[PDB]
RNA sequence: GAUGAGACGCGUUUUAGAGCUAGAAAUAGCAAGUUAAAAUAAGGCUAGUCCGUUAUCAACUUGAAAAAGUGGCACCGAGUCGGUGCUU
DNA sequence: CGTGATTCCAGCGTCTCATCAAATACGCA
DNA sequence: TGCGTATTTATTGGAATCACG
């Protein structure tokens, strides 16, 4: 019971735990079993694993929330449009909007005429005959000057507002500029007139078809550059073309500018950057930029609308009418040609909705792509369809007006069409003339991203602040929403608070206070020595002020030489001085001060300390906002101190990034006794010159005490809140929370005794043959070799490591100039550049293909320096072709030096011991805080529980070297097994090397890993001395013998004990047997975490009308039998009810008991009042006490070990684990991994001999699977088919049969049934669609660890 | 990458879009086919251009809810955990 | 007439704007 | 040379359908 340890394995879908003792034994304890059964106690081994679904992200929820908000706002836009038209529409037709709102209802449910637009059959038919589409009506309203019906005008405006296009372009977009040729020629002429010394020729360049083609952006750019003579990708006119296409070039090096100001047109106003540029370059660029703007508009418009704008003022309605006319003509031609040539297929094409024909393209679910793919061979087979096929090649055959590619239409086109309609119709309807502005605002209004939801303090996503409390509308939005405050909260609601003080916002990165603090902190520790003086001394306040004034303020960058010369000789009159504490140049620089001096040109204003806070606000404004107008609005407060030109210059400048410390730290806190802030202490601290870290960690000052006292707010908050603040995927956070709860429960298990040690290992989350072939080809081409031409090779064939190295090594040995043969791969060997006794490097950087074994020349160290000198030129040739990396080249060439130094072994042990990931560090912090809570009275932490972080590499090497193989397809026990091994390794490490604690164990322990660890070239005595081991390997003490290089083996003592304390750490004669017995234990606490299902109500797909009760109504008044609806609801949790239901026409009461599925939609109604919900469902006289809530994955034990996990009200899942013997697992791993098994060739031969001599294990495993299936699975057909398939392929090789058996293990796996394959036979899944059996089984409530159980006998809870 | 916020195109259903000719009707033949309104998780109250799909979740005793509490040891073994003895 | 046994199937693309953080690869005092 | 910094980042119910004897 005393001195136990806990090992854990954290994963995205599993958390394995194992409690071990000092002797590496897993205890077994009697746990009391609660409930109403005859069982009172059970025996449980303290090892197991918790299984749960992956933690989903909120991305889908966020997208659905945005979709809901957008739908609500679109409906509100339609409501506003109806509000504008309410009185006039009521004058014309009072029920028009009512018919529009009830158009969805069937004729029976309609309270008005079934025709929405006109209310009568004749007028509706006339409208649809005159206007086949809405675009015909839109074009008619745009062009015709006759008075139009109000209903048609409203319909056009509603279509425009409801579908208004994107807002990716700022400013107006005139649709007339559609002729690409004329505008391109004009831009070419302007460019030639600008740079007359560097003209270009545009003759024979039809840019319209080049840029308007349905091709890639970069492809079209390259084609246009190639077409233009003397034009390149980076050419200035090419830069203008890229700007039109969507790039952001500049004109710095183009013989004009001295800085790198950039201008872009697709974003922002663009009317201020252009003016600023023209202020420098005059009016020369005005015509060129006008032509560039025209071409940029034309490039978009030509692809958006091909129709010329001279004919009509609505180029989008005209384009859609052209689409309709082409569709009609092509449809008639296709009908005629098909009826003429292929009449038989005509019946299918135009009537079979199930096929991807025209009927399936229009009335069916087939899309444009599917329709084209189906009808292209038919068109090619026929004759006279050449034009139709040409149209199909351009994806312009039988097109619809509402297609998937209408997302490139900007809102400017719809706005222009709406404006044209309002201009035409304002003369007849005065209210249209009055509300034209309101309608345009409705169409063009878009909530700024920095404003967010327009809530009123009842939402957890909103941050908007209101100047006044009133209903927000587009017409008064700027009059209500505080845009500046909204953007300030938008930026600051997600920025990090100060590390020391959590209640204060952090300062901007480029704030003057931050830069001054950094400069003073850096100058605090600077020391200077002169020849005359004896001892180095710090800089005084006056000296630092003079240095800042003369160096940091005069020049942006300050160097050590500049400090020595420009100040000490000019002011201090010191000819020579040696300065320590700064190298090359200072890291801190007053760049913001220089920028402000350049902008405002006011030395006094910047130097004045009174104006400093105003600057702290100005820089905060510049960092906070990026919109020019709101930046000007925020700077209006300080606009009374600077001129309009200075204000504009400040507006144009931008800053990004945030600092790490707040003003409350730098100057917000003052020492009680001295009355000085951190900055004040940095300015003058006597001669000690304490830096920021010393100031915040000084007992003589109240800084640390005040920081801690203000840090108690939020200190030790809820565990869930702390885990949520961590950085990582939500699944990993769920795993961390489950691990912490498992640790707490395990501590509860052991009598409230904290474990001596805790070990953790978080598995890292998250074709290549073609990449390897590409790399080899690039290297060969760069080096100029032609070995690839001599010997053909394939991408996949390079997957073999030996052949991959062979092609990388120029078909030669890496150490010997002799050639190599592909046929003799077995005759060749793979050797590690750094020996296995020095590093566990299994990558290509370490593996090398060598024919011989003694050709290295040096066994202990890196191969002999003579071979290195011989192969240096060839290795350099390989490096120049990028066939190898630089680090492996250095490792190979280290034979030039004396050998592998202690730095290499220190790096190796650092690599092998600790993980660089910070998520494991945060998990260790959480565990240490929750376990080590006692505080020593000496201001120290009582580290009574050690938290160790181990890499998966160590456990994997342990398994692959000591034959503790794992197979993930057998069962989930491997999870727990890994945890156990982790614990063992961790304990076996910390007992073996107590002086490396700070390497792995979480804590502020002393650090020494260079001299005290690595010994001299003394294998026999180096380990015996204070040095741990000459070899850098961490787990070499586990093995009995260690192979040094190739061919020679050294021997270690059979019992490994600590050198200093003398404690026995590893008994190789007993510990291995204990580990084998632990891994062979059949009883492992595998727990599937029961979860109430959350998410969507049902399938989002809306099914058509159907006379079935499985459909879910989309709305309260919409009967699914007439309007369709959703189906396939998701059950959050089942409910076991014991009640009676009326049966027969006599309504006799009969006792019943069954599981009722409570869906996500009905969860709230059931939880509000279960009795009424059950009565509505049909049950009568429900017993509330016997109502049992069963979440998903609820465990039931029926009989003879059969365990079923509840998955729904009408389906179960397999809930048993197959405790396959470890011998079978090892045999399967060896046989399946017949190749690439790694290790010495003798070991590989021994493993192959074992596999060949234990072929009967295949039949034994088949019999085991059959027995387990008959005992638990009870899948007769699947088991019979598996047996037949196994008997059919008994003559297949051992590796294939082993892999097929691994696949066959899917039948008996835990969880939902799944289909698998045995060679070519495909076995499906037997689904247990009956939940009537679990009503008489034994329900099991399992705790998180599963040791604490409660068995409820459901047979007792029966009405009979 | 995670979290947020603004938008866009669709997609899907019901109805409108008269299908016509002949044929007792069934049914044949021919015609048309592009579009539109409504909804897009049921809905809730706080009534907002708000919120409704993330996370949390053995059971029992509590505690509104958070949260808390609720369960001999050792030994031999082992087909999913059993027995042996002590305490209990 | 349940009773298995079989089959099909499941909303989805495109932009903008932040913020943070760890991950990875140098910088540096 | 560790702290510090500059950019980059198919599954499993459900429903229907199909023998089906």
From Swiss-Prot:
Mn(2+) 1 binds at residues 9, 761, 765. Gene3D superfamilies: 1.10.30.50, Ribonuclease H-like superfamily/Ribonuclease H. This is CRISPR-associated endonuclease Cas9/Csn1. Disruption phenotype: Loss of correct processing of pre-crRNA and tracrRNA. Loss of immunity against a plasmid with homology to CRISPR spacer sequences. Has 2 endonuclease domains. The discontinuous RuvC-like domain (approximately residues 1-62, 718-765 and 925-1102) recognizes and cleaves the target DNA noncomplementary to crRNA while the HNH nuclease domain (residues 810-872) cleaves the target DNA complementary to crRNA. Monomer. Binds crRNA and tracrRNA. The lineage of its organism: Bacteria, Bacillati, Bacillota, Bacilli, Lactobacillales. Coexpression of Cas9 with an artificial single guide RNA (sgRNA) which fuses the crRNA with the tracrRNA in human cells has shown it is possible to target and modify DNA sequences of interest. Cas9 plus the 2 sgRNAs have also been expressed individually in human and mouse cells to achieve DNA targeting; cleavage efficiencies of the artificial sgRNA were lower that those for systems with the 2 sgRNAs expressed separately. Microinjection of Cas9-encoding mRNA and a synthetic sgRNA into zebrafish embryos induces targeted mutations. NCBIfam families: cas_Csn1 (TIGR01865). Belongs to the CRISPR-associated protein Cas9 family. Subtype II-A subfamily. Residues 1091-1360 are annotated as: PAM-interacting domain (PI). Residues 917-1094 are annotated as: RuvC-III. One of its GO terms (molecular function) is DNA binding. Residues 717-764 are annotated as: RuvC-II. It comes from Streptococcus pyogenes serotype M1. Residues 55-717 are annotated as: Recognition lobe. Changing residue 975 to A: Only cleaves 1 DNA strand, probably the noncomplementary strand. CRISPR (clustered regularly interspaced short palindromic repeat) is an adaptive immune system that provides protection against mobile genetic elements (viruses, transposable elements and conjugative plasmids). CRISPR clusters contain spacers, sequences complementary to antecedent mobile elements, and target invading nucleic acids. CRISPR clusters are transcribed and processed into CRISPR RNA (crRNA). In type II CRISPR systems correct processing of pre-crRNA requires a trans-encoded small RNA (tracrRNA), endogenous ribonuclease 3 (rnc) and this protein. Changing residue 855 to A: Only cleaves 1 DNA strand, probably the complementary strand. Processes guide RNAs correctly. In vivo, loss of Cas9-mediated CRISPR interference in plasmid transformation. The active site is at residues 9, 832. Changing residue 978 to A: Only cleaves 1 DNA strand, probably the noncomplementary strand. Processes guide RNAs correctly. In vivo, loss of Cas9-mediated CRISPR interference in plasmid transformation. Its cofactor is Mg(2+).
């Amino acid at each position: 019971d005393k001195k136990y340890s806990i090992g854990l394995a954290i994963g995205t879908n599993s958390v394995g735990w194992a409690v071990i003792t000092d002797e590496y034994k897993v205890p077994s304890k009697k746990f009391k079993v609660l409930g109403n059964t005859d069982r009172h106690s059970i025996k449980k081994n303290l090892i197991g694993a918790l299984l749960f679904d992956s933690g989903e992200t909120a991305e889908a929820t966020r997208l659905k929330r945005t979709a809901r908000r957008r739908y609500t706002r679109r409906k509100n836009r339609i409501c506003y449009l109806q509000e504008i038209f309410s009185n006039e529409m009521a004058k014309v037709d009072d029920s028009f909007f009512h018919r529009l709102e009830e158009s969805f209802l069937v004729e029976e449910d309609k309270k008005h005429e079934r025709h929405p637009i006109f209310g009568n059959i004749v007028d509706e038919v006339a409208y649809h005959e005159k206007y086949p589409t809405i675009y015909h009506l839109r074009k008619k309203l745009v062009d015709s000057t006759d008075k139009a019906d109000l209903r048609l005008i409203y319909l056009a405006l509603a279509h425009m507002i409801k579908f208004r296009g994107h807002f990716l372009i700022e400013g107006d977009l005139n649709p007339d500029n559609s002729d690409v040729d004329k505008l391109f020629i004009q831009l070419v002429q302007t460019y030639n007139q600008l740079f007359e010394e560097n003209p270009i020729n545009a003759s024979g360049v039809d840019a319209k078809a080049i840029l308007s083609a349905r091709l890639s952006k970069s492809r079209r750019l390259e084609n246009l550059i190639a077409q233009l003579p003397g034009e390149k990708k980076n050419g200035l006119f090419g830069n203008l073309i890229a700007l039109s296409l969507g790039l952001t070039p500049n004109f710095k090096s183009n013989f004009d500018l001295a800085e790198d100001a950039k201008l872009q047109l697709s974003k922002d106003t663009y009317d201020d950057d252009l003016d600023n540029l023209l202020a420098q370059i005059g009016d020369q660029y005005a015509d060129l930029f006008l032509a560039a703007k025209n071409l940029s508009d034309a490039i978009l418009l030509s692809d958006i609308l091909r129709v010329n704008t001279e004919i009509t003022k609505a180029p989008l309605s005209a384009s859609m009418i052209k689409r309709y006319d082409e569709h009609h003509q092509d449809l008639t031609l296709l009908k005629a040609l098909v009826r003429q040539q292929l009449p038989e297929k005509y019946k299918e094409i135009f009537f079979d909705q199930s096929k991807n024909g025209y009927a399936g393209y229009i009335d069916g679910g087939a899309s444009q792509e599917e329709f084209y793919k189906f009808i292209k061979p038919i068109l090619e087979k026929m004759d006279g369809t050449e034009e139709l096929l040409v149209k199909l090649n351009r994806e312009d055959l039988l097109r619809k007006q509402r297609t998937f590619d209408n997302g490139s239409i900007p809102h400017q086109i719809h706005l222009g069409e709406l404006h044209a309609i309002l201009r035409r119709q304002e003369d007849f309807y005065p209210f249209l003339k009055d509300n034209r502005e309101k309608i345009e605002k409705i169409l063009t209004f878009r909530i700024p991203y920095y404003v967010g939801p327009l809530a009123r303090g009842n939402s957890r996503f909103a941050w908007m602040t209101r100047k006044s409390e009133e209903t927000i509308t587009p017409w008064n939005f700027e009059e209500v929403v505080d845009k500046g405050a909204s953007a300030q909260s938008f930026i600051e609601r997600m920025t990090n608070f100060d590390k020391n003080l959590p209640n204060e916002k952090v300062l901007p990165k480029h704030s003057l206070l931050y830069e001054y603090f950094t400069v003073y902190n850096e100058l605090t520790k600077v020391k200077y020595v002169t020849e005359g003086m004896r001892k180095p001394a710090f800089l005084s306040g006056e000296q630092k002020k003079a240095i800042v004034d003369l160096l940091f303020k005069t020049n942006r960058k300050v160097t050590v030489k500049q400090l020595k010369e420009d100040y000490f000789k000019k002011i201090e009159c010191f000819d020579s001085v040696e300065i320590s504490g700064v190298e090359d140049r200072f890291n801190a620089s007053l760049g913001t001060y220089h920028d402000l001096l350049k902008i405002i040109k006011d030395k006094d204003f910047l130097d004045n300390e009174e104006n400093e806070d105003i600057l702290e606000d100005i820089v905060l404004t510049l960092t906070l906002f990026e919109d020019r107008e709101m930046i000007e609005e925020r700077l209006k407060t300080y606009a009374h101190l600077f001129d309009d030109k200075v204000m504009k210059q400040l507006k144009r400048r931008r800053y990004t990034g945030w600092g790490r410390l707040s003003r409350k730290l730098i100057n917000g806190i003052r020492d009680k006794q001295s009355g000085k802030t951190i900055l004040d202490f940095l300015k003058s601290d006597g001669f000690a010159n304490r830096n920021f870290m010393q100031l915040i960690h000084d007992d003589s000052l109240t800084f640390k005490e005040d920081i801690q006292k203000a840090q108690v707010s939020g200190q030790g908050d809820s565990l869930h809140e702390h885990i949520a603040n961590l950085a990582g995927s939500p699944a990993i956070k769920k795993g961390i929370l489950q691990t912490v709860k498992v640790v707490d429960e395990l501590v509860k298990v052991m009598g409230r005794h904290k474990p001596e040690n805790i070990v953790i290992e978080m598995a890292r989350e998250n074709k290549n043959s073609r990449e390897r072939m590409k790399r080899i080809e690039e290297g060969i081409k760069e080096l100029g070799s032609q070995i690839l031409k001599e010997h053909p090779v394939e991408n996949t064939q390079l997957q073999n490591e030996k052949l991959y190295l062979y092609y990388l090594q120029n078909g030669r040995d890496m150490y010997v100039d002799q050639e190599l043969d592909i046929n003799r791969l077995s005759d060749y060997d793979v050797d590690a550049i750094v020996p296995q006794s020095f590093l566990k490097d299994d990558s290509i950087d370490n593996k090398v293909l060598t024919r011989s074994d003694k050709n290295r020349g040096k066994s202990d160290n890196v191969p002999s320096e003579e071979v290195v000198k011989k192969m240096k030129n060839y290795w350099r040739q390989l490096l120049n072709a990028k066939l190898i990396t630089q680090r492996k080249f250095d490792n190979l060439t280290k034979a030039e030096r004396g050998g592998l130094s202690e730095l290499d072994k220190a790096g190796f042990i650092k690599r092998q011991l600790v993980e660089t990931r910070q998520i494991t560090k945060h998990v260790a912090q959480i565990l240490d805080s929750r376990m080590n809570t006692k505080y020593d009275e000496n201001d120290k932490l009582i580290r009574e529980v050690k938290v160790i972080t181990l890499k998966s590499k160590l456990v994997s090497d342990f398994r692959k070297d000591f034959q503790f193989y794992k197979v993930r397809e057998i069962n989930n026990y491997h999870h727990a097994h890994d945890a156990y091994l982790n614990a063992v390794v961790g304990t076996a490490l910390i007992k073996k090397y107590p002086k490396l604690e700070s390497e792995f164990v979480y804590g502020d322990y002393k650090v020494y890993d260079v001299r005290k660890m690595i010994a001299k070239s003394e294998q026999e005595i180096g380990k015996a001395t204070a040095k741990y081991f000459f070899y850098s390997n961490i787990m070499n003490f586990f093995k009995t013998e260690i192979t040094l290089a190739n061919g020679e083996i050294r021997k270690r003592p059979l019992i490994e004990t600590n050198g200093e304390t003398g404690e026995i750490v590893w008994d190789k004669g007993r510990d291995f047997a204990t580990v084998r017995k632990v891994l062979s234990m059949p009883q492992v606490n595998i727990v599937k975490k029961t979860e109430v299902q959350t998410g969507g109500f049902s399938k989002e797909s809306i099914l058509p009308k159907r006379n079935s009760d499985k459909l879910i109504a989309r709305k309260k008044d919409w009967d699914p039998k007439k309007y369709g609806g959703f189906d396939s609801p998701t059950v959050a949790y089942s409910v076991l009810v014991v009640a009676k239901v009326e049966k027969g026409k006599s309504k006799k009461l009969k006792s019943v008991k069954e599981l009722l599925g409570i869906t996500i939609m009905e969860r709230s109604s059931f939880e509000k009042n279960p009795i009424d919900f059950l009565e509505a469902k049909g049950y009568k006289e429900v017993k509330k006490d016997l109502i049992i809530k069963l979440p998903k994955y609820s465990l039931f034990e029926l009989e003879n070990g059969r365990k079923r996990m509840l998955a729904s009200a009408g389906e179960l899942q397999k809930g048993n684990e197959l405790a396959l013997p470890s011998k079978y697992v090892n045999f399967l791993y060896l046989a399946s991994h017949y190749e690439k098994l790694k290790g010495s060739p003798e070991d590989n031969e021994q493993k192959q001999l074992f596999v060949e001599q234990h072929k009967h294990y295949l039949d034994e495993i088949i019999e085991q699977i059959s027995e387990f299936s008959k005992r638990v699975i009870l899948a007769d057909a699947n088991l019979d088919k598996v047996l037949s398939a196994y008997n059919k392929h008994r003559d297949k090789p051992i590796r294939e049969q082993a892999e097929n058996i691994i696949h066959l293990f899917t039948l008996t796996n835990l969880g939902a049934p799944a289909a698998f394959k045995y060679f070519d036979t495909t076995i499906d899944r037997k689904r247990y669609t009956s939940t009537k059996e679990v009503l008489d089984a034994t329900l099991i409530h399992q705790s998180i660890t599963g040791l604490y159980e409660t068995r409820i006998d459901l047979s007792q809870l029966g009405g009979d």
